Design a protein around this ligand. Structure first.
Ligand SMILES: Cc1cc(N2CC[C@@](C#N)(C3(C)CC3)C2=O)cc(C(=O)NCc2cc(F)cc(-c3cnn(C)c3)c2)n1
Ligand SMILES: Cc1cc(N2CC[C@@](C#N)(C3(C)CC3)C2=O)cc(C(=O)NCc2cc(F)cc(-c3cnn(C)c3)c2)n1
Ligand code: PRO
Ligand code: PRO
Lengths: 486, 486
């Protein structure tokens, strides 16, 4: 036995640790800020990787592999780990482990691009990167080493590069919403939060109700011609004039797994959406001592064969030395979306008993109907997980008009949607003021408190003219989404 | 235009550089010993990765991801890169970048394994590793950073672990011989060349005729209980006695791509076996100015659709601004195994002209027969590439009886197969003596010269009794394969 015992709504940090440890998703490691990704989590990564990989291939993006090292000269042209020695011997100049690969890839782009016939150039890589913050890590969400993909494209015009930025952002919306059943908000980052050196940064943002925090889920940047100028990346049109290329950068990490875990989990542990579950259906035979155990197990194998013909991912837990109750809890903790139970009474009726992980509802299904009924049940579970999560997202955002509605909203663990003048100085003033007010409240009470922009959403509600900015009183420009954050 | 101009049989090093650069497989990089893997090579890696990944999954191996860092304490429990600083700040203790992950994974294994019901434990990861030799690199073959997979299993008995070692070695034989059409020899490493800390190391070895050198293609180790003792990895049987587990480690790298390139390439450039070619068939329309170009291109699209229904990977090069001659050479350099040409005379007859890359032989195929004929042609090209390579392997090995047949054989750029007493001191004496004799010959002549064991092959020819060892005159034990090497 091993059950989750912290409650998700009472001690959220302990609950999250129990849910990912007791389900065997992660293991700790002697170097702080790094975690081991065990197969139960890694299978989910492989599934979303396959999804995204297939979609970018349809766009003409190709995979590649660039070195993990970058020279001091190129990098600084900051949370970076430096290699200064090979064995006993001092490197003649220190080299960094990649935090991101713009400065690794771009010198090569400048060599490869000569003519408009070389554009567009579209590359991606799957690798890990290192960002060495000396603050406390969170499994999946903030770690010193993490797996990601990063794509990098170059175009003859700004408009084509922007079109690609938005197409990729839509793929990230599908990664979260269609595979992981996590609702996200598309938007533009503020000038203070956009990618250093870029022109415009787009994002999809997620929300964690139990601590009130927004979290950036993935990112797609219009670099414009800024990096082209730094690295001298130019092409000749068909008339022979040299022009800078226009570039994009975009990435998504194993952070997505953590967001999925927090979104769907419950007091019993993980709940994995059917579309990414490596086991969608666990078959548990009931194995009384005084029964025809061979016949029961034979029928479980037949059912498995039948379900796999419909591309359902099935595992039979025929372990003799554990009870069905033990098995129920074991696969509940691991988040398997459907359990199928089969005992001598079911065999006698030609049915199976099926229990859905999200709600506990049980069904009796004839064997003839099993494959289509289970297909529709998984699609219902997927949809239900998304819709419930989406309603929590919408309950979690307060539309406000002025600044002293902020702290009450933040104390409800909500995000705020507010008209903003988008002046860069005001974002830093707001972060400092909300941090300060959070400190005072902590002292009245017996993990940063600051509120920052999460994004300026693509979906703008009506902006009546004359609407003033909630903090400066200046004319508002757009509705901006703010909250505490990761 | 861009043609290979160094001849493979005259300046092999220049030829190999031209073949991988002009085909856009690799790009140089500012940190020596590291190379960029561009898509044309990376697609081949993805193909063999998919092959091997599917086969180990059938064995119950699961993928995982362990950190790239290892603490000094665990590592030293040597060509290793040390991180000693994050930004400006000194790490309290230096940490190494993984050269291999036994010391990273094994502490976790000791935590995870408790009972015989936890065995066997079978994990793999796809990642890169760093081995920081300060000698001159060779693209694909010997580099400071390379991609690989490494698998690690633990078993309740030696016999099961050995059975797994040999099953994996057979997968590596299939990786080389069935995907890459490269012949390899299975064998056991000598006691001096086996994995440090292991019990027995098995290998598949390849041979490069143009420089006479053997090269280890992949490796599968019986670690036995040695690492179990170091890391205290124990299980309880069903009677409650603690026993050490028995372990295996195995890996294969992007070195395989380089071996494939050297094996099949010719004076025109790369030749890629059909089973791993990302483009198997390139369709080149003939586009005379005074022709119905629309009809020709329409038929090329129809042919492409028809071939892809048979799972043939097809690209149409309909570029207007290059000649067919230019295109022929461009895709020859890149190693595409089949070219299909279509002009107005072919359209008028309902045929296409097909040219095979390995031999230059051309065929006229009716459109109705195209899919099955091309399928059989690709299988013939694959087989032909393997069989020709296998005959070069067999021409390259001399069976000898005594030591002064060694240097003449080595001067023919051959490997030698010799009866050996398998005493460890004699291997080091032989390496020093052959190195010395090679130096003298270099001075008479106007990249190490030493001969070492490559492996003790599983396929042993007859050993008449009384046969003495070719170097010590002591009783021979087994036939051993020796040569200059990478
Ligand atoms: C997994 C992951 C994911 C992400 N991000 C960044 C945005 C992005 C998105 N979308 C990417 C990269 C895809 C574009 C994403 O996924 C960032 C980090 C990270 O910043 N790690 C360092 C670290 C270690 C650490 F121990 C602690 C902290 C730490 C503690 N408190 N604070 C304030 C920081 C930070 N890590
Ligand atoms: C790609 C790759 C592959 C391999 N191996 C090793 C065996 C194996 C097999 N089978 C593995 C790892 C799978 C088990 C394989 O693939 C080794 C190296 C390597 O040793 N790199 C360091 C280096 C850098 C460098 F610039 C120069 C040298 C150098 C120059 N002269 N000499 C004598 C060395 C070495 N690299
Ligand atoms: O780190 C980032 O945010 C961008 C997107 C992936 C590559 N660099
Ligand atoms: O480096 C090696 O040879 C073994 C096999 C892969 C992991 N370690």
């Amino acid at each position: 036995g091993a059950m989750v015992t912290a409650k998700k709504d009472e001690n959220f940090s302990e609950w999250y640790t129990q849910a990912i440890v007791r389900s065997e998703m992660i293991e700790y490691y002697d170097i702080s800020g790094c975690y081991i990704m065990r197969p139960w989590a890694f299978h989910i990564w492989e599934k979303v990787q396959r999804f995204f990989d297939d979609e970018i291939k349809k766009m003409g993006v190709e995979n590649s592999y660039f070195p993990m090292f970058v020279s001091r000269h190129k990098l600084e042209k900051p949370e970076v780990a430096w290699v200064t020695h090979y064995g006993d011997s001092p490197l003649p100049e220190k080299i960094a482990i990649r935090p991101t690969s713009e400065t690794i890839m771009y010198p090569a782009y400048a060599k490869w691009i000569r003519s408009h016939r070389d554009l567009p150039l579209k590359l991606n890589q799957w690798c890990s990167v290192v960002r060495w913050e000396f603050k406390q890590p969170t499994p999946f969400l903030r770690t010193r080493e993490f797996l990601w993909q990063e794509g990098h494209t170059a175009h003859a015009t700004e408009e084509e590069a922007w079109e690609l930025v938005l197409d990729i952002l839509e793929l990230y919306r599908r990664w979260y919403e269609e595979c992981l059943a996590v609702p996200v908000i598309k938007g533009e980052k503020s000038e203070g939060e956009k990618f250093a050196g870029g022109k415009k940064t787009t994002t999809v943002e997620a929300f964690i109700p139990e601590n009130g925090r927004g979290i950036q889920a993935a990112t797609s940047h219009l670099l414009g011609t800024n990096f082209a100028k730094m690295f001298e990346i130019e092409f000749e049109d068909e008339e022979g004039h040299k022009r800078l290329v226009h570039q994009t950068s975009w990435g998504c990490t194993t952070r997505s797994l953590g967001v999925m875990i927090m979104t769907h989990g419950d007091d019993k542990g993980l709940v994995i959406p059917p579309r990414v579950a490596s086991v969608q259906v666990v078959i548990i035979p009931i194995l009384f001592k005084d029964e025809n155990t061979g016949e029961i197990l034979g029928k479980c194998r037949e059912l498995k064969t039948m379900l796999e013909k419909a591309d359902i991912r099935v595992r039979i837990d025929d372990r003799s030395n554990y009870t069905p109750g033990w098995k129920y809890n074991h696969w509940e903790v691991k988040g398997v979306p459907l359990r199928l139970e089969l005992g001598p009474k079911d065999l006698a009726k030609g049915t199976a008993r099926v229990v859905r992980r999200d709600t506990g509802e049980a069904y009796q299904i004839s064997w003839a109907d099993l494959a289509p009924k289970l297909l529709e049940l998984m699609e219902g579970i997927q949809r239900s997980l998304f819709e419930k999560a989406k309603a929590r997202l919408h309950e979690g955002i307060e539309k406000i008009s002025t600044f002293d509605e902020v702290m009450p909203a933040l104390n409800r663990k909500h995000l705020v949607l507010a008209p903003w003048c988008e002046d860069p100085e005001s974002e830093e003033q707001i972060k400092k003021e909300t941090q300060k007010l959070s400190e005072i409240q902590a002292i009245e009470a017996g993990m940063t408190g600051a509120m920052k922009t999460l994004c300026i959403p693509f979906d703008q509600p009506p902006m009546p003219e004359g609407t003033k900015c909630f903090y400066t009183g200046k004319p508002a420009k757009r509705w901006t989404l703010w909250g505490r954050s990761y």
